[PDB]
């Protein structure tokens, strides 16, 4: 009745027609890259960088 996404932590993947594949709700959770360096993906199978947040109008 309350969803998988309502309590945080189980996974969900998404497929689109005109948009990009996504994974999970809280997976990459914040105060992880606050310290050290969590350097990010060195890409070899490049999916996007900002997830279609442009073309706002």
């Amino acid at each position: 009745m309350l969803s998988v996404a309502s309590r945080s932590g189980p996974f969900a993947p998404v497929l689109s027609a005109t948009s990009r594949g996504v994974a999970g709700a809280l997976r990459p959770l914040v105060q992880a890259a606050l310290p050290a360096t969590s350097e990010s993906p060195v890409l070899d199978a490049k999916r996007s960088f900002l997830c279609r947040e442009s073309l706002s109008g």
């Binding site: 009745m1 998988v4 996404a5 945080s8 993947p13 998404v14 027609a17 594949g21 990459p28 992880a32």
Partner: protein, 418 residues
């Protein structure tokens, strides 16, 4: 206004619509399918079904679906979990009856031609490698395999030996047995209630009934280690908790916010997280801790999640686990239970705020409980959790049999028996 119209058809179908007066519409179909309904002879069929939404159907070719939806600026997407699949269509308000006919062709009359299914097999390898660039994707698939014997041990992504071998007859068998009318909910957000009903008797002609009888999930207390070359160690440690829609499940949700479930301030030091403050007493390297919660229809998992450096991984896990023991023997202030209820209530009202979050919230209620409840009924259930119920949930974790999964350089990580 007009809060929601809610209707059950005489063969199980649930229909629910809300009439906003917004310029855009959203229509979703929610099904009880997903990776928990496949056995060991057809693993990965649900992953390929997710990728196949724009193939040829009986009422439109694969050219007409891609060209017809893009002509009006619309979208089509599929979202899945271990227990559910969701097909979503959105466009502007004048175009929504064009995109409804496309959505009923993708789900109620697919063809699976040989040459189209064979060209799609290589997409399974691309989609899995993109998702596994996040280290939490593989840790959380290994954690479900360590925790269950079956039903809830199947991954969201196709296994490597199986890529290239999902046949068209396996796809025809999955849809015929799991996509039936008593397992489906049709949810509309900017449409009327009689127009969705006439859409519904267009696929009320076939696929009646419940499907097949998946099995109960059986708990296994196991361990899976994965040595690799990643720079940080990820680790998770859980126990069996409580199913969705019970009074103990609300107590585990409150306990998650007592310990800490993610930050509220950008670059803040997490001053009201119990787990984060206890680890930081003796560890002065970069890290991150969180409480983990996952609730399902017949079982649940609760525990902790750490990210640390390799030489500090045992120090972080012991400090975090020692904090849950302090709660389980009575140390729990009353102003801490109240601040946890505020974070749980405010997070629930912020997640139903947009059209995507609201449609998801209504669709999961119709599959599991078969009804709709207002957020004021939900907010009463959270305030009726007592302080003794939170202490009892922390004793079920401490005394229960554990499961574990880890990855990285595991030379200083403890085993689940130590």
């Amino acid at each position: 206004p007009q809060d929601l119209e809610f209707t059950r058809l005489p063969n199980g179908l649930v229909i629910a619509s809300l009439e906003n007066y917004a310029p855009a519409s959203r229509i979703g179909l929610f099904i009880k399918a997903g990776s928990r309904y496949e056995d060991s002879n057809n693993l990965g069929t649900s992953h390929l079904l997710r990728l196949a939404s724009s193939l040829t159907t009986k009422g439109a070719s694969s050219f007409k679906i891609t060209r017809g939806i893009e002509a009006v600026g619309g979208k089509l997407s599929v979202t899945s979990t271990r227990e559910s699949m969701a097909y979503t269509v959105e466009c502007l308000r004048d175009d929504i009856e064009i995109l409804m006919e496309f959505l009923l062709n993708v789900t109620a009359a697919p063809e699976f031609r040989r040459w189209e299914v064979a060209a799609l097999q290589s997409q399974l390898r691309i989609d899995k490698a993109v998702a596994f660039q996040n280290p939490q994707a593989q840790v959380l698939e290994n954690l479900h395999a360590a925790a269950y014997r079956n039903a809830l041990a199947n991954s969201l992504y196709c296994p490597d030996y199986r890529i290239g071998k999902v046949t068209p007859d396996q796809l025809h068998y999955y849809v015929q047995n799991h996509f039936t009318s008593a397992r489906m909910a049709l949810i509309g957000l900017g449409v009327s209630h009689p127009v969705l009903k006439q859409v519904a008797e267009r696929f009320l002609n076939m696929r009646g009934g419940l499907g097949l009888s998946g099995a109960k999930a059986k708990y296994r207390g196991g361990e899976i280690r994965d040595q690799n070359g990643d720079s940080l160690v990820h680790a998770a440690l859980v126990a069996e908790s409580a199913a969705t829609g019970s009074a103990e499940a609300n107590a585990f949700s409150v306990l998650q916010h007592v310990l800490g479930a993610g930050p509220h301030v950008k670059r803040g030091s997490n001053a009201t997280s119990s787990l984060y403050q206890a680890v930081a007493k003796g560890v002065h390297q970069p890290f991150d801790v969180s409480a983990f919660n996952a609730s399902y229809s017949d079982s649940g998992l609760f525990g902790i999640y750490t990210i640390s450096q390799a030489a500090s991984a045992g120090d972080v896990i012991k400090s975090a686990y020692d904090q849950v023991k302090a709660i389980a023997q009575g140390n729990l202030s009353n102003t801490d239970v109240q601040a946890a209820k505020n974070k749980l209530k405010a997070g629930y009202l912020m997640s139903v705020e947009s059209s995507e979050g609201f449609l998801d919230e209504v669709g999961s209620q119709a599959l599991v409980a078969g009804s709709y409840m207002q957020p004021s009924t939900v907010l009463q259930q959270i305030d009726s959790v007592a302080d003794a119920d939170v202490i009892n949930a922390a004793k079920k974790f401490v005394s229960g049999r554990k499961s574990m999964a880890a990855s990285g350089n595991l030379g200083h990580t403890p085993f689940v028996d130590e």
